[PDB]
């Protein structure tokens, strides 16, 4: 292949807390190929779950490349904080990674970030307290041991509405007026949250990990970002499983999680002379080798197709549970509508109000109607 212009510059990379050490190793691999791109790796101010805020507060001071959860991408694209990937970069992402990873980064048919990990929550449990059979159903698990969780976190519990048969922004998460939780099915989910307050096997906590460490919890729901810490806390007792079934409408139905795609995006407001270097870095740190280094350190699940089939990943307990949860019917891809910030801000008090009893059952249909109106604005 004929000579291409040398890639050079100086770029800053934002990653989540605890991820810097192994991204520095990935950057060392990057610099074997691109020695003239100087990279500084730091944590971001508030993490990938807060990227649109961290970047938007001052785009020209934000990192050139930053970690960002896929739900934020439509808002950031519409605001002009991230540009479409090039045709060649898009083609490579789409060929190399699982289909849902490409869907996760695509807004209006164009890709806006470089996906690298698949996130779906699972049950982590102490297998000296609960067996694999015990964790198959929510009522059966919670009758036997304490599950510690947070009903103020809508990422944990909104997917019960999806188990109930409602849609979030319509059939593929792209329909502004497509959330239909203002229905009898939505009321079923509200009642399920409310049931948990008096379930002595369910503990509300802001820090489920601490309850696992203290032994107060037999099980938690969590994502693969915390898997290394959970393995160390639980030791010989570590076990993981997909979410259980729950009882809604007289049936047993799989309890869903969200399916999130973790990504890196290029800041369109970072220094112009460094934009080529930034895109080159984003492509490299999300390549197959880099995804497998992330897996080796944190246990997060690659989106690269070959990595998912590889012996190490296919046989890993956490990866197996996460990949099962990623299947249709077990999870729903987080939508990326620009309305998502409003959705998150309004969904948490809706769910927590049902759980705590602050919202009585006589108000469920009213509160669901107001919620749909509030999250469906153009
Ligand atoms: O200690 C935790 C955290 O606390 C502080 O964050 C708060 C923040 O300041 C508030 O503004 C608010 O955040 C809201 C947020 O701005 C909204 O965008 C929205 O968020 C939704 C996300 O957009 C959506 O993607 C999803 O988020 C889930 C992620 O997709 C998923 O990956 C996972 O996230 C975990 C990370 O993967 C993991 O690396 C690890 O991250 C650590 C951070 O890197 C580190 O900065 C710190 O985070 C602080 C933060 O700095 C404070 O400002 O510690 C993290 C580990 O403790 O862990 C992540 C999980 O914590 O899971 C998230 C879901 O939890 O859904 C969210 C909606 O739930 O709404 C937000 C809430 O209104 O609140 C946060 C939290 O109090
Ligand atoms: Cl159940
Ligand atoms: Cl149940
Ligand atoms: Cl509301």
Q: Which ligand lies nearest the alpha carbon of 244?
A: 2
What's the CA gap between 133 and 122, in Å, rounded? Answer: 15
Please give the distance, rounded to the nearest whole angstrom, from the Cα atom of residue 219 to the centre of ligand 3: 16
H helices within the chain, ranges in order?
20-33, 51-56, 73-79, 87-96, 99-105, 138-142, 154-157, 159-163, 184-195, 208-214, 227-234, 275-285, 288-298, 305-309, 311-314, 317-325, 340-356, 364-375
End-to-end CA distance of the chain: 48
Closest ligand 1 atom number to CA of residue 153: 69
Query: Where does residue 8 rank: exposed (0-12), middle (13-18), buried (19+ CB within 10 A)?
Result: middle
Closest CA to 186 of 354, 24, 36: 354
Please give the distance, rounded to the nearest whole angstrom, from the Cα atom of residue 35 to the centre of ligand 1: 34
The approach used to solve this structure was X-ray
Pocket lining: 17 vs ligand 1, CB cutoff 6 Å: yes
Residues 6+ apart with CB under 8 A from 31: 37, 39
Q: Which ligand lies nearest the alpha carbon of 335?
A: 1
Please give the distance, rounded to the nearest whole angstrom, from the Cα atom of residue 367 to the centre of ligand 3: 22
> Do 337 and 173 meet the contact criterion of CB atoms below 8 Å apart?
yes
Pocket lining: 62 vs ligand 1, CB cutoff 6 Å: no
Pocket lining: 223 vs ligand 1, CB cutoff 6 Å: yes
Closest CA to 39 of 376, 284, 254, 359: 284
List, in sequence order, every residue forming a beta bridge with 181; answer none if it has no partner. none
Closest CA to 194 of 368, 347, 356, 366: 356
Closest CA to 179 of 337, 372, 371: 372
Resolution in angstrom units: 0.9
Q: How many Cα atoms within 13 Å fall on the side-chain side of residue 220?
A: 28
Residues 6+ apart with CB under 8 A from 249: 164, 185, 188
- Long-range contact pairs involving 29-32 (C-beta distance under 8 Å, separation at least 24): 29/284, 29/289, 29/290, 29/293, 30/281, 30/284, 30/285
């Amino acid at each position: 292949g004929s000579h291409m212009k040398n890639v050079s510059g100086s770029v800053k990379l934002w990653v989540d807390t605890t991820q810097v050490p192994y991204y520095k190793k990935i950057v060392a691999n990057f610099n074997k190929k691109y020695p003239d791109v100087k990279v500084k790796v730091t944590q971001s101010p508030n993490g990938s779950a807060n990227a649109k805020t961290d970047v938007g507060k001052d785009p020209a001071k934000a990192a050139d490349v930053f970690e960002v959860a896929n739900d934020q991408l439509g808002s950031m694209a519409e605001a002009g904080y991230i540009n479409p990937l090039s045709p060649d970069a898009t083609k490579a992402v789409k060929n190399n990674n699982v289909a849902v990873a490409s869907e996760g980064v695509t807004w209006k048919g164009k890709m806006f970030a470089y996906p690298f990990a698949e996130q779906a929550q699972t049950i982590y449990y102490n297998k000296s307290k609960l067996t694999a059979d015990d964790v198959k159903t929510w009522d059966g698990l919670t009758a036997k041991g304490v599950l510690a969780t947070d009903f103020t976190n809508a990422y944990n519990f909104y997917p019960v509405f999806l188990s109930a048969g409602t849609q979030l922004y319509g059939k593929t998460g792209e329909t502004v007026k497509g959330t239909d939780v203002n229905s009898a099915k939505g009321e079923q989910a509200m009642a399920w949250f409310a049931q948990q307050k008096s379930n002595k096997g369910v503990m509300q906590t802001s820090n489920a990990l601490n309850q696992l460490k203290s032994g107060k919890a037999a099980a938690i729901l969590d994502g693969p970002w915390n898997s290394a810490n959970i393995k160390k806390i639980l030791g010989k007792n570590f076990a993981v499983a997909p979410y259980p079934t729950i009882k809604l409408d007289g049936k047993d139905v799989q309890m869903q999680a969200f399916l999130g795609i973790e990504t890196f995006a290029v800041n369109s407001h970072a220094s112009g002379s460094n934009q080529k270097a930034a895109a080159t870095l984003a492509s490299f740190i999300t390549n197959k080798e880099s995804q497998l280094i992330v897996y080796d350190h944190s246990g997060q699940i690659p989106v690269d197709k070959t990595a998912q089939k590889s012996s190490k990943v296919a046989s890993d307990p956490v990866a197996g549970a996460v990949m099962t949860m990623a299947k249709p019917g077990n999870s729903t891809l987080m939508p990326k509508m620009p309305q998502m910030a409003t959705f998150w801000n309004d969904a948490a008090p809706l769910i927590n109000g049902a759980y705590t009893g602050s919202i009585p059952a006589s108000q469920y249909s009213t509160k669901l109607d107001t919620f749909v109106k509030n999250i469906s604005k153009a």
